[PDB]
Design an enzyme around this catalytic site. Structure first.
Site, PDB file in Angstrom:
ATOM      1  N   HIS A 232       0.831  -1.193   0.000  1.00 33.86           N
ATOM      2  CA  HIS A 232       0.000   0.000   0.000  1.00 33.86           C
ATOM      3  C   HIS A 232       0.871   1.252   0.000  1.00 33.86           C
ATOM      4  O   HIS A 232       0.567   2.234  -0.676  1.00 33.86           O
ATOM      5  CB  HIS A 232      -0.936  -0.002   1.207  1.00 33.86           C
ATOM      6  CG  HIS A 232      -2.062   0.978   1.098  1.00 33.86           C
ATOM      7  ND1 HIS A 232      -2.161   2.093   1.900  1.00 33.86           N
ATOM      8  CD2 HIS A 232      -3.132   1.013   0.270  1.00 33.86           C
ATOM      9  CE1 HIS A 232      -3.249   2.769   1.577  1.00 33.86           C
ATOM     10  NE2 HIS A 232      -3.856   2.136   0.590  1.00 33.86           N
TER      11      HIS A 232
ATOM     12  N   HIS B 101      -4.400   6.179  -6.085  1.00 35.73           N
ATOM     13  CA  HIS B 101      -5.474   6.921  -5.437  1.00 35.73           C
ATOM     14  C   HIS B 101      -5.826   8.141  -6.280  1.00 35.73           C
ATOM     15  O   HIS B 101      -5.126   8.456  -7.243  1.00 35.73           O
ATOM     16  CB  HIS B 101      -5.071   7.341  -4.020  1.00 35.73           C
ATOM     17  CG  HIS B 101      -4.789   6.190  -3.105  1.00 35.73           C
ATOM     18  ND1 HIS B 101      -3.511   5.743  -2.843  1.00 35.73           N
ATOM     19  CD2 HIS B 101      -5.618   5.395  -2.389  1.00 35.73           C
ATOM     20  CE1 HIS B 101      -3.567   4.724  -2.004  1.00 35.73           C
ATOM     21  NE2 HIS B 101      -4.834   4.490  -1.714  1.00 35.73           N
TER      22      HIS B 101
ATOM     23  N   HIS C  74      -7.271  -1.863  -5.348  1.00 34.77           N
ATOM     24  CA  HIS C  74      -7.501  -2.411  -4.019  1.00 34.77           C
ATOM     25  C   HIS C  74      -8.207  -3.761  -4.081  1.00 34.77           C
ATOM     26  O   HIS C  74      -8.087  -4.572  -3.162  1.00 34.77           O
ATOM     27  CB  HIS C  74      -8.305  -1.420  -3.181  1.00 34.77           C
ATOM     28  CG  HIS C  74      -7.524  -0.206  -2.786  1.00 34.77           C
ATOM     29  ND1 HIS C  74      -7.578   0.976  -3.491  1.00 34.77           N
ATOM     30  CD2 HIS C  74      -6.656   0.002  -1.768  1.00 34.77           C
ATOM     31  CE1 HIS C  74      -6.787   1.865  -2.917  1.00 34.77           C
ATOM     32  NE2 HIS C  74      -6.216   1.299  -1.869  1.00 34.77           N
TER      33      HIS C  74
ATOM     34  N   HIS D 213     -15.020   6.301   2.502  1.00 36.89           N
ATOM     35  CA  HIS D 213     -13.726   5.628   2.541  1.00 36.89           C
ATOM     36  C   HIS D 213     -12.709   6.433   3.346  1.00 36.89           C
ATOM     37  O   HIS D 213     -12.068   5.910   4.258  1.00 36.89           O
ATOM     38  CB  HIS D 213     -13.197   5.396   1.127  1.00 36.89           C
ATOM     39  CG  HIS D 213     -11.752   5.015   1.081  1.00 36.89           C
ATOM     40  ND1 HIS D 213     -10.767   5.885   0.671  1.00 36.89           N
ATOM     41  CD2 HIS D 213     -11.126   3.854   1.384  1.00 36.89           C
ATOM     42  CE1 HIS D 213      -9.594   5.279   0.730  1.00 36.89           C
ATOM     43  NE2 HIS D 213      -9.784   4.045   1.158  1.00 36.89           N
TER      44      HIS D 213
ATOM     45  N   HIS E 176     -10.711   6.040   7.440  1.00 37.30           N
ATOM     46  CA  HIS E 176      -9.267   6.144   7.629  1.00 37.30           C
ATOM     47  C   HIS E 176      -8.910   7.126   8.740  1.00 37.30           C
ATOM     48  O   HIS E 176      -8.094   6.819   9.609  1.00 37.30           O
ATOM     49  CB  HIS E 176      -8.583   6.565   6.328  1.00 37.30           C
ATOM     50  CG  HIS E 176      -8.309   5.426   5.395  1.00 37.30           C
ATOM     51  ND1 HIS E 176      -7.236   4.577   5.558  1.00 37.30           N
ATOM     52  CD2 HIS E 176      -8.967   4.996   4.293  1.00 37.30           C
ATOM     53  CE1 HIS E 176      -7.244   3.672   4.595  1.00 37.30           C
ATOM     54  NE2 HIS E 176      -8.284   3.904   3.815  1.00 37.30           N
TER      55      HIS E 176
ATOM     56  N   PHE F 231      -1.796   6.757   4.182  1.00 34.15           N
ATOM     57  CA  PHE F 231      -1.634   5.682   3.207  1.00 34.15           C
ATOM     58  C   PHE F 231      -0.426   4.797   3.508  1.00 34.15           C
ATOM     59  O   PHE F 231      -0.497   3.574   3.380  1.00 34.15           O
ATOM     60  CB  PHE F 231      -1.485   6.254   1.792  1.00 34.15           C
ATOM     61  CG  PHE F 231      -2.751   6.839   1.217  1.00 34.15           C
ATOM     62  CD1 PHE F 231      -3.993   6.304   1.524  1.00 34.15           C
ATOM     63  CD2 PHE F 231      -2.691   7.919   0.352  1.00 34.15           C
ATOM     64  CE1 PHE F 231      -5.149   6.842   0.986  1.00 34.15           C
ATOM     65  CE2 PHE F 231      -3.844   8.462  -0.189  1.00 34.15           C
ATOM     66  CZ  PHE F 231      -5.073   7.924   0.128  1.00 34.15           C
TER      67      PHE F 231
ATOM     68  N   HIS G  11     -11.449  -2.078   3.378  1.00 37.79           N
ATOM     69  CA  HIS G  11     -11.427  -2.080   1.918  1.00 37.79           C
ATOM     70  C   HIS G  11     -12.197  -3.256   1.330  1.00 37.79           C
ATOM     71  O   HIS G  11     -12.554  -3.243   0.151  1.00 37.79           O
ATOM     72  CB  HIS G  11      -9.988  -2.086   1.410  1.00 37.79           C
ATOM     73  CG  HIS G  11      -9.389  -0.721   1.314  1.00 37.79           C
ATOM     74  ND1 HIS G  11      -9.347  -0.007   0.137  1.00 37.79           N
ATOM     75  CD2 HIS G  11      -8.840   0.080   2.258  1.00 37.79           C
ATOM     76  CE1 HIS G  11      -8.780   1.166   0.355  1.00 37.79           C
ATOM     77  NE2 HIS G  11      -8.464   1.243   1.634  1.00 37.79           N
TER      78      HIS G  11
HETATM   79 CU   LIG Z   1      -5.281   2.728  -0.754  1.00 40.99          CU
HETATM   80 CU   LIG Z   2      -8.165   3.170   1.956  1.00 42.21          CU
END
Ligand SMILES: [Cu+2]
Ligand SMILES: [Cu+2]
Length: 513
Positions: free
Chosen positions: A93, A116, A125, A252, A256, A273, A286
């Protein structure tokens, strides 16, 4: 000119993007993968007999949970040098989201790859979890192994499942989480860095609306759902990011920042990230984002169609599989879940978010209309305070037939800001409530928001982005389908001190079929 991952074991560099504080980063920036002298082979579809059934993290059987715990425990036990290890998988990632690779294979070695903020978000993902899932399964001799998924689109599944809680003896545990959020607290799918002092009842209702907002209101077409077009040669400096999807910049991102430990330098682990992969819940989060893709199509609403652009289909990444082989995978090959031999266990009923459209605004709660128009406003404007402006619509009083052919979309372009920190501002359209009218975080005037996890590039100090909001339902919900101008209100929430907006306009987007 599709984005093409290079030989990741040959061409790679330490992560230098999206990490505001590298000096004191608790996790490593050396995210390059192991070099075992393997040749990159083309992907081959699985010959699995049964379909891997992913399960809700809050409704798992004793077997499902134990198998998952035993699998992570096995992964944590491997050497760091092993591609299948807990550390190696997390680094994947970091490498892809924090400028580990470049577009050198496409002839642009001075331009980093960023999965992203683009239409590569969902497919990447999916592949990421695909190999990750099959690796865990092979480590415990479970051919039918399936990841859980954080079903935060369902009330009882909104709090962090207790399987991830406890102490260090639990493989699924992570100390680097927001302490104020690990106490069986309900997730905020529209989190902006500060907890809301609202009842649990309100938060669930707003979470359900957020899902509806991301999948229906704003996820009106492939561009608004998956994200903007991103081809080889595209640089975040020349000029800016591919517009971000509704899910990615919405629910999403919220999870995070809600899970990540705010006391840590870069809000590790989930808050960034480069470190998100070190938290087991990341993959389970995810897993549901991956499921949003499935649900978005199963809605079978107009515009909810797959991408057919060859530049998307032919985009590829490289991963290690359970056999430590380097495999190149393409976006075109992950659209069908049946071919990847896995799916999600659904409630046999109606989704609780399916009808979470904001309630119709009563005219008795609204007043009649002094706000300047775009022609009267000097751009770019800085969002260090609430900004209001009237935008000329492309049409008025559109029939039901007209609305089924094109979406009226509010476009906020040239959003410049320092991406060293988390940024978010809210967008309200045609807000004209009387004084003393009760308001909620899920009112019809609320079009959604633009939220961005730090992804600042190595050679620029400012990133540029774009947001897309559907107005077909909103204008009805606000009783303003007949008005020539739409009053757009931008409310900064965090990291907007230096943020500026370059352009605002409303356009009719034809619905693809
Ligand atoms: Cu990601
Ligand atoms: Cu994510």
């Amino acid at each position: 000119a599709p984005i093409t991952a290079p030989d990741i074991t040959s061409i790679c560099k330490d992560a230098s993007s999206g990490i505001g504080n590298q000096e004191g980063a608790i996790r490593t920036r050396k995210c390059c993968p192991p070099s075992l002298g393997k040749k990159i082979k083309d992907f081959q579809f699985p010959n699995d007999k049964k379909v891997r059934m992913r399960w809700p993290a809050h409704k798992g059987t004793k077997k499902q949970v134990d198998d998952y715990r035993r699998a992570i425990a096995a992964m944590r036990a491997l050497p760091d040098d092993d591609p299948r290890s807990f550390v190696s998988q997390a680094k994947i990632h970091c490498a892809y989201c924090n400028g580990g690779y470049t577009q050198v294979d496409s002839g642009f070695p001075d331009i980093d790859i960023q999965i992203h903020n683009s239409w590569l978000f969902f497919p990447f993902h999916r592949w990421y979890l695909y190999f990750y899932e099959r690796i865990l399964g092979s480590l415990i001799d479970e051919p039918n192994f399936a990841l859980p998924y954080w079903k935060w689109d369902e009330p009882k599944g909104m709090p962090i499942s207790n399987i991830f809680l406890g102490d260090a003896s639990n493989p699924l545990y992570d100390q680097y989480r927001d302490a104020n959020h690990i106490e069986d607290r309900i997730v905020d799918l529209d989190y902006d860095g500060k907890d809301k002092d609202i009842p649990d009842q309100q938060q669930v209702a707003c979470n359900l609306s957020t899902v509806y907002r991301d999948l229906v209101r704003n996820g009106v077409d492939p561009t608004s759902f998956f994200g903007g077009k991103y081809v080889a040669g595209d640089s975040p400096v020349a000029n800016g990011d591919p517009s971000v999807g509704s899910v990615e910049a919405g629910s999403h991102t919220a999870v995070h920042r809600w899970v990540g430990d705010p006391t840590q330098p870069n809000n590790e682990d989930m808050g960034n990230f480069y470190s998100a992969g070190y938290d087991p819940v990341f993959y389970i989060h995810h897993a549901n984002v991956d499921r949003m893709w499935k649900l978005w199509k199963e809605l079978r609403l107009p515009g909810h169609v797959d991408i057919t652009d060859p530049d998307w289909l032919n985009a590829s990444y490289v991963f290690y599989d359970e056999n430590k082989d380097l495999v190149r995978v393409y976006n075109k090959d992950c659209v069908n879940l049946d071919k990847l031999k896995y799916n999600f266990i659904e409630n046999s009923e109606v989704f609780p978010w399916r009808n979470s459209r904001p309630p119709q605004r009563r005219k008795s709660a609204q007043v009649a209309t002094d706000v300047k128009t775009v022609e009267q406003t000097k751009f770019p404007v800085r969002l260090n305070q609430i900004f209001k402006v009237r935008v000329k619509r492309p049409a008025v009083n559109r029939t039901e037939e007209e609305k089924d052919q094109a979406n009226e979309v509010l476009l906020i372009k040239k959003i410049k800001y320092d991406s060293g920190k988390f940024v978010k501002f809210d967008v309200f359209v045609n807000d004209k409530l009387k004084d003393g009218v009760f308001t909620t975080p899920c009112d019809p005037e609320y079009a959604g928001g633009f939220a961005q996890i730090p992804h600042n590039d190595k050679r620029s100090m400012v990133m540029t982005s774009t947001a897309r909001f559907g107005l077909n339902e909103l204008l009805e919900d606000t009783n303003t389908e007949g008005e020539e101008y739409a009053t757009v209100t931008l409310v900064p929430r965090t990291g907007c001190e230096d943020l500026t907006v370059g352009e605002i306009k409303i356009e009719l987007v034809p619905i693809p079929k």
